[PDB]
Amino acid sequence: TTVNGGTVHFKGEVVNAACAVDAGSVDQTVQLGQVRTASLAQEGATSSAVGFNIQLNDCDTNVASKAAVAFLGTAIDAGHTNVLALQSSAAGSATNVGVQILDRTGAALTLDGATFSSETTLNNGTNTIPFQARYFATGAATPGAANADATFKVQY
Amino acid sequence: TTVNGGTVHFKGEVVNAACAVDAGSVDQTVQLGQVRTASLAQEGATSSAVGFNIQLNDCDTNVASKAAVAFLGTAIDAGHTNVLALQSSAAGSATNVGVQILDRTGAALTLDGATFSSETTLNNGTNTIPFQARYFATGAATPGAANADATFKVQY
Amino acid sequence: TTVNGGTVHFKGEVVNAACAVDAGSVDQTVQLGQVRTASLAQEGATSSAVGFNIQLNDCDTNVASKAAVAFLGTAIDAGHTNVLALQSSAAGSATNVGVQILDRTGAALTLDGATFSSETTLNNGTNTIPFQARYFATGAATPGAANADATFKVQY
Amino acid sequence: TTVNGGTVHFKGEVVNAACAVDAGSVDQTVQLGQVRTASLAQEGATSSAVGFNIQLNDCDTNVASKAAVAFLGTAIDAGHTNVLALQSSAAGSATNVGVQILDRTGAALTLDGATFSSETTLNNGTNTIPFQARYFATGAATPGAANADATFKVQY
Amino acid sequence: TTVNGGTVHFKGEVVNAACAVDAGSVDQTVQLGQVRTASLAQEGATSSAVGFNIQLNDCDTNVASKAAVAFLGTAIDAGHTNVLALQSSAAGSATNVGVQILDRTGAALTLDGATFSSETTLNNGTNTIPFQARYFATGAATPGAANADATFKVQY
Amino acid sequence: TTVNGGTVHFKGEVVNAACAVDAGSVDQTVQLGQVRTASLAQEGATSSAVGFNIQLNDCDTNVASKAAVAFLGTAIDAGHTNVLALQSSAAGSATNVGVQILDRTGAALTLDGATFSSETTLNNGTNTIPFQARYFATGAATPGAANADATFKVQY
Amino acid sequence: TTVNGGTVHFKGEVVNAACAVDAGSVDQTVQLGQVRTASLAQEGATSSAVGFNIQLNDCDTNVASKAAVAFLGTAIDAGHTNVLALQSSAAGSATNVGVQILDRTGAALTLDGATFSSETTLNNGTNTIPFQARYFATGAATPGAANADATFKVQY
Amino acid sequence: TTVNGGTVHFKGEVVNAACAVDAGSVDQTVQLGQVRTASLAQEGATSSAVGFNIQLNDCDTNVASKAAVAFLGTAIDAGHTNVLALQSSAAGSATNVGVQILDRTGAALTLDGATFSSETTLNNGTNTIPFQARYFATGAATPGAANADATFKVQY
Amino acid sequence: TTVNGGTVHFKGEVVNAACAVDAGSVDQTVQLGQVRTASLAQEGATSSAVGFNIQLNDCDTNVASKAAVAFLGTAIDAGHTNVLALQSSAAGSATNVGVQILDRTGAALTLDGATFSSETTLNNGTNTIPFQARYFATGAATPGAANADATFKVQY
Amino acid sequence: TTVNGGTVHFKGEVVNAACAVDAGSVDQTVQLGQVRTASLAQEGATSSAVGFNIQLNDCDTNVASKAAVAFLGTAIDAGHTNVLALQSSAAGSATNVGVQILDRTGAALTLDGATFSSETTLNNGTNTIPFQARYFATGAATPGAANADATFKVQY
Amino acid sequence: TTVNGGTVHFKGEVVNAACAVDAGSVDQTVQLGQVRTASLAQEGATSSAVGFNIQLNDCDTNVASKAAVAFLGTAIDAGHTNVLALQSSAAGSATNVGVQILDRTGAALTLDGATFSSETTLNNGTNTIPFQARYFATGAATPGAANADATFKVQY
């Protein structure tokens, strides 16, 4: 007495390099929280800040004992190259505001897909490259939904 | 020697009001536990009860030294307005049963998104508004999976 | 060295009213699950039930601090006005069965496009109006594929 | 005991260049959402904004380690060269409004099929070039259906 | 106050056999993607490969607990009987290239309308017979549009 | 250096009434699927059923806040006035079978061009009037091609 | 045992120039929709607007990296040179109305067969030149059938 | 109050054999497209190629489970027996060029009315025998209109 | 430098009544298809059946909100008054066979020019009165060419 | 064993000028349709209007890059020089009515054989000069058959 | 003041058997991760491995106290019957590699839709059948995107 179920959908990658990503760690999701224009209403204001993490597994330091990352993603302005713009349904989200990411070095990384981060040190096996998320305003902000996306390119 | 990773997805909000939510505290998840119809099989039975928590951070009492919450969510019946109904895949979950939430005041709150809770007192900075979860039956219950959802609206 | 790609297709609406829909939330898709005639074979049986959600964004309560919804869609019978009939390729799907939706009030809503739901309370900004999906049989059911569709009209 | 079925229709391209498009990513569809003239009724208003994505696969950086895109599509006006006009059945859609796309650089791209975007950096293999969609009004807008189309030309 | 609309056109089949096709699943359309001669320029090269699906519904295993498929369609050569040739407007599409389909068994099926596939196992109700599409070159290929068609005959 | 192309052919209507049809929605085409006489071989059998949709755009409720539809088209018999007969090349299609359409009310509508449907409720702007297609046999059916046509008259 | 069938009729062109047309794309047909005099009853009114597309294939930019189009077709008036008049059986169609086409530039093109459009940019291979169709009234319009035709001349 | 209309003209055939043709499928018309001498200017050049289809309906495999086709039509030369010549008004069409048809086997079929094609396999009911149209030059071609005709004889 | 062309020949009618015919719709031509004596060899056999259409335009319901049609044409026999006989060159066509037309009511209409059809309902403007063509044998048929003609008289 | 057939009759022209006519396009026949005195009963009434086409082939723009047409034919009155009178068997056709032709410019052309039309632009090869036919009454019209003829003179 | 929203689309099944699937658990998606050819470049190599889960709900052991699963899906080779092949856009994904699934028994299951798994033990209510995903190479692998699909058939 057999029956039908449905469909399964596996994902992943195959990439020939030093480390290997737990792509859930990249596809990891964050809830930065609920934020106010009471503080984040200035051309330069940084709200308080929240952590982010990366996971690598089973890594050979001989191919590359080091690593870094570049990001891309829709930035706001040519004078705010390290800021990420938001992506939610139209007429909903906020304005005069973006998102900033901080390296291990506390560094505002550019969204170009070239601006590689600091050369992380890699052990054998497993590592972690934590970044710290926050908002970096671009003037008096709108009370709006906040939702974003950025692509995770890596250097070894 | 660069490589691809994948996608990142940040979340949050921007809301101009007194306090600011750690939206993980709202998106906080509970495992109430495994429960029996041995006790929860009556039009009025309350199973034993479990705690729930809220987190606010960096709050100015001058905008609002107080706060409260209304909830909404699929209730069961018009005579059981303070009960929450369950949301799991069909043919699986239980019946003749719902969920109750209790305020700081031990109060059965309504699921309408208007029925604001007790006016919490707010300090400067950080606060906590714990609620207590439990089941509130609506007759002899089914042995079924229990899974729910409710939206978290706030007053300041 | 340029090349061809292909076509892009954007969608949306422009509607002058209080709130604004994340039309992905309406075009949101559900997988209620796999269900049995072991329970859903009666003129009145309700299978266990699953949740559904709505999203509004950047809403002014002054235009309308409230809101509701009517639905339409192919119902089955004039004596089952709150039931939705199924829409899959012919000779495949089930029979003597439909679908029910439940309001926040646990209410069997009619498929007419007029039967507005309960007057939701609207904050400023962003809200959620969860409904709960389930099957509502119309006698002993066929083992058949289950697939449906309903249109999402709104009141403010 | 054989029977008839029907017709199948495969699609694709063959193009000799650096990367190769997942033409579903171009033929990718967006639901920007439902939008209001409450905000989008000005010669310059930008509604809140939503994300868009591109996919390339199995790319050799030696042919071209870089890439960009030009778009074409029916724009509205010669003074609004970066705006896209809407394409739905006549007498239905809105007016005094169009659509804007934003580069990774937050750039209003022209609809000519020549105005190549920023030179994306390409790794080996797989990349992503996210754009951000929104409306850019051209005065007080009509409440109308919103539906669009734009062609996706690429530079390597 | 009545008005004119226009014409409707329904389609389908009536076939007396074990299963019944969701002829949208056959008339299902694929966008394999954009492909390069950088890899697909050899008498035998297989580009990377994409999936395809079939849908049957409400099937009796007693008439036939099994099933298979033959295809026909314009192949290229008598020495490439399992390859499908392309069908787009003249002077546009590519050359020295075709299309291959793969069975559940990873099998290059012939385009004759007789070469029945592997005997799929059929449950009661609903099934799926996924195939995998790709290109199978016949020498150094032209950069050209790629567009195809194949007829879907079935065995029970 | 100019050249010849060919001919273009636009279509449409101009009708002075409440709503306006996206006549593609009427000229919309359906593939109901492949169907069996295993179930559809009775004077009254209804095969499983598939959905159909209508689109109106930019509608004023003041001219008419309501609407309905009558259909015409070659029916089979005077005792089967709500059934549609099939229209394919002769000696090909099936027999002892027709097609049924179901209103929003699940109603077998007559093919006369007068039998107006239920009075749909019309909002401002855009609406949808989904119908559900299926076969309604007239005895033991032939295995034959199934192809139909019906005209779409409207009431406001 | 042979039999008769009938006649086949192929079509096309042979033209020595840069690109080559998919003459189905020119002979492409549109259903603009059903339209009202409620809006289109003014000497200058533009109904909402619908898209149109062109297809070129296997194009050499060295012969001509650019291209444009002129149209001809029965216009209405010498003061409405960019308007197309309608062509349906007599006493049927509407009056005090025509049709407008819009370039990629949103430009009212003349029906002369000389007024070449904007110089499109041509890649190698395949391109698309979308136009946008709509009605451009010439006073209070008749409720009448709408049907048109225009010839597609090209510049390289 | 009766009136005159006009004349109707039905067509068809009556032929006693295995299958039965949808003679619209034979009388089916193709628009191969617009083609260039840039590629089609050689004694042997094949332009890129487009598909063609056939339709049979309600076929008994017992009379003949197989089928094929011969063609006739004005060919060009005794050394180009598989080429079709063009038929348009004099002084208009092209020269040093013809048309080729390809079988399911990718076979240049002769225009004699005897050269039967590959023995297609016939199911019960309905089948399809797709051919692929293209040009096969006979030297440097004229830029001329392209228009053709060929008769469709069948084997069972 | 003028030249000669040739002759033009316009046609039509002028008739004072409710609706007005698109006399192309009457002079519309059908290709019913190729048919077999395998089924159509009985005193009463009806081959499978194909559709036919009528077009009226710009109609006033006040002169006549209704309409119908009578036909005439060479019938076969006084006992087969609803059958149409065939008209092709002598010694060619078939025998023991005719043609049947079916009303919207599925009605065998008489060829007399008096037997008015069902009273169609007429809207304002444009309507359609589809009929369905098929063969109605008069015994074992000849394999012969099939070609017919019938005159289209109308009632308002 | 030879037999007799009959007579063949070819036609055409030989004219030394820029373009060459597909004299079927001139000898092309139109069925304007059935028309009413309900609208066409005024000294100036124009019924709704239908299209007409011309075909030229293999044209050299160097002899003449331009072209136009004059018409002649039996007009009605010296005050209605642009109207064409009707030519059917006597006592049959209508009266107080004629026919009008419209240029590409929407121009009432004179029937003299001198009044050359607008200077069409000619490409190389093939062109089209569409005109639009309609009736232009000369008072209250008779219900009568409508049939006409006009000669097609050309300028280069 | 009502407005339009959009469309909803529910899904599911109705199947008469012991347990009932949370078809989200089948339609559950996995991100296995990013993988290297540094280890997965051998005819037999198994990369490290990741978990997968199933969900059943409200199950009666009396109909069936046991259960198992067969899978189907495009495998690679007849000598690698337990391997799943990948399905992403062409020219993108990897090669000389597939995917393996492991039963509760650590068993390489076949993709046939018949090879039922181990007989799971079923309690009353709710169960879980975890599988473990990994790659099983077929030689030295390509660095390519990895994406798959497999159908979930069940035994009770």
Q: Do H91 and J57 touch (CB under 8 A)?
A: yes
All residues of chain G having their beta carbon less than 8 Å from the beta carbon of residue I20 are 89, 91-92
Say what the resolution is, in angstroms. 4.2
Q: How far apart are CA C53 and CA K66, in angstroms?
A: 35
Q: Do A85 and D121 touch (CB under 8 A)?
A: no
Q: How far apart are CA H40 and CA H144, in angstroms?
A: 12
Between G and I, how many CB-CB pairs are < 8 A? 32
Q: How far apart are CA C82 and CA C74, in angstroms?
A: 10
Token code pair at residue J111: 């029937």
Token code pair at residue J3: 């037999």
All residues of chain H having their beta carbon less than 8 Å from the beta carbon of residue I84 are 10
Q: How far apart are CA B43 and CA B36, in angstroms?
A: 15
Chain J from 40 to 59: CB within 8 A of any G CB: 40, 46-51
Q: If you write DSSP's letter for every residue of I57-115 in order, what string do you get?
A: EEE-TTT-SEEEEEEE---S-TT-TTEE---SSTTTB--S--EEEE-TT--B--BSS--
Check if F134 contacts I (Cβ < 8 Å): no
Q: Do K91 and D23 touch (CB under 8 A)?
A: no
Q: Do A93 and C55 touch (CB under 8 A)?
A: no
User: What secondary structure letter does DSSP report for F59?
Assistant: E
Exposure string (b/e) for H76-105, b if CB count within 10 Å is 16 or more? beeebebbbbbebbebbbbbbbbbbbbbbb
DSSP SS3 for J17: coil
Mutation choice for F interface testing from C26, C71, C72, C74 by most F CBs within 10 A: C74
All residues of chain B having their beta carbon less than 8 Å from the beta carbon of residue A119 are none
Q: Quick one: how far is CA I70 from the chain centroid? A: 10
Beta bridge partners of I84: I99
Q: Scanning every residue of chain G, which has its alpha carbon at the shortest distance from the alpha carbon of I12? A: G90
Token code pair at residue C133: 């999906």
Q: CB–CB of E104/K74 below 8 Å?
A: yes
Q: How many CB atoms lie within 10 A of CB D51?
A: 21
User: What secondary structure letter does DSSP report for F89?
Assistant: S
Token code pair at residue G41: 């009853």
Q: How far apart are CA J118 and CA J107, in angstroms?
A: 9
Indicate the residue type of D147: N
Stretch (H or E) spanning G146 = strand G145-147
Q: How are beta strands J66-72 and D50-52 bridged, if at all?
A: unpaired
Q: CB–CB of I61/H41 below 8 Å?
A: no
Token code pair at residue B102: 């209790």
Q: CB–CB of A116/A70 below 8 Å?
A: yes
* Sheet arrangement for strand F11-14: G34-35, F11-14, G145-147
Q: What angle do CA H130, H132, H136 make, to 5 degrees?
A: 155
Stretch (H or E) spanning I26 = helix I23-26
Q: How far apart are CA J32 and CA I45, in angstroms?
A: 39
* Terminal CA-CA length for chain D: 53
Assess whether chains H and C touch, using the rule of 3 or more C-beta pairs within 8 angstroms.
Answer: no
Check if K1 contacts D (Cβ < 8 Å): no
Q: Do G132 and D85 touch (CB under 8 A)?
A: yes
Cβ neighbours of residue B34 closer than 8 Å, sequence gap 6 or more: none
Q: How far apart are CA B139 and CA B40, in angstroms?
A: 8
All residues of chain E having their beta carbon less than 8 Å from the beta carbon of residue F38 are 16-17, 60, 63
Pick from H49, H12, H22, H18: nearest CA to H123: H18
Q: How far apart are CA B148 and CA B83, in angstroms?
A: 11
Q: Do H34 and G13 touch (CB under 8 A)?
A: yes
Nearest to G90 among J48, J105, J106 (CB): J48
Chains contacting C with at least 3 CB pairs below 8 Å?
A: A, B, D, E, F, G, K
Nearest to K13 among A4, A14, A63 (CB): A4
Q: CB–CB of D123/D156 below 8 Å?
A: no
Q: G1: exposed, middle or buried (C-beta count within 10 Å: 0-12, 13-18, 19+)?
A: exposed
Cβ neighbours of residue G151 closer than 8 Å, sequence gap 6 or more: F5, F6, F7, F8, G71, G72, G73, G113, J127, J128, J130
Pick from C24, C21, C30, A51: nearest CA to B24: A51
Q: How many CB atoms lie within 10 A of CB J6?
A: 4
Q: Do I58 and G144 touch (CB under 8 A)?
A: yes
Q: How many CB atoms lie within 10 A of CB C62?
A: 8
Check if I152 contacts H (Cβ < 8 Å): yes
Assess whether chains D and C touch, using the rule of 3 or more C-beta pairs within 8 angstroms.
Answer: yes
Backbone angles phi, psi at C15, to 5 degrees: -140, 125
All residues of chain K having their beta carbon less than 8 Å from the beta carbon of residue E46 are 95
Torsion of CA C60, C63, C68, C73, to 10 degrees: -100
Pick from E135, A100, K51, K99: nearest CA to D11: E135
Q: How far apart are CA D69 and CA D102, in angstroms?
A: 12
Mutation choice for D interface testing from F37, F57, F59 by most D CBs within 10 A: F57
DSSP SS3 for G23: helix
Q: K121: exposed, middle or buried (C-beta count within 10 Å: 0-12, 13-18, 19+)?
A: exposed
Q: If you write DSSP's letter for every residue of E28-92 in order, what string do you get?
A: -B----EE-TTTSEETT-B---EEE---EEEE-TTT-SEEEEEEE---S-TT-TTEE---SSTTT
Backbone angles phi, psi at G56, to 5 degrees: -120, 155
Nearest to A143 among C23, C24, C125 (CB): C125
Q: Do D9 and E29 touch (CB under 8 A)?
A: yes
Q: How far apart are CA J58 and CA J21, in angstroms?
A: 9
Q: How are beta strands I34-35 and H11-14 bridged, if at all?
A: parallel
Q: How far is residue H152 from each of residues A67, B99, E97, H77, I31, measured CA to CA in Å?
A: 68, 73, 29, 20, 15
Indicate the residue type of B17: A
Chains contacting A with at least 3 CB pairs below 8 Å?
A: B, C, D, E, K
* Sheet arrangement for strand G99-102: G50-52, G131-134, G99-102, G83-84
- Name the minimum distance, in Å, from the CA of K52 to any CA of chain F: 34
Token code pair at residue A122: 């890699």
Stretch (H or E) spanning D24 = helix D23-26
All residues of chain G having their beta carbon less than 8 Å from the beta carbon of residue C7 are 128
Q: How far apart are CA A122 and CA B131, in angstroms?
A: 45
Q: Do G89 and I57 touch (CB under 8 A)?
A: yes
User: What secondary structure letter does DSSP report for A142?
Assistant: P
Check if D104 contacts A (Cβ < 8 Å): yes
Assess whether chains I and C touch, using the rule of 3 or more C-beta pairs within 8 angstroms.
Answer: no
* Terminal CA-CA length for chain B: 53
Q: How far apart are CA E113 and CA H120, in angstroms?
A: 7
Backbone CA torsion sign across K62, K128, K8, D23: negative
Token code pair at residue A93: 């989200």
Backbone angles phi, psi at B91, to 5 degrees: 70, -5
All residues of chain F having their beta carbon less than 8 Å from the beta carbon of residue J51 are none
Q: Using the structure block, give the residue that is written with the tokens 């109603």.
A: F107
Mutation choice for A interface testing from C57, C93, C126, C147 by most A CBs within 10 A: C57
Q: Do A145 and C124 touch (CB under 8 A)?
A: no
Check if K18 contacts B (Cβ < 8 Å): no
Helices first, then strands: H and E counts in chain I: 1, 16
Q: Do I123 and E7 touch (CB under 8 A)?
A: no
Q: How many CB atoms lie within 10 A of CB D42?
A: 14
Q: Using the structure block, give the residue that is written with the tokens 């349906």.
A: G88
Q: Do H126 and D4 touch (CB under 8 A)?
A: yes
Q: How far apart are CA K67 and CA H133, in angstroms?
A: 54
Between E and I, how many CB-CB pairs are < 8 A? 10
Q: Quick one: how far is CA I24 from the chain centroid? A: 13
Residues found in chain K: 156
Q: What angle do CA H88, H91, H94 make, to 5 degrees?
A: 65
Q: How far apart are CA E134 and CA E149, in angstroms?
A: 13
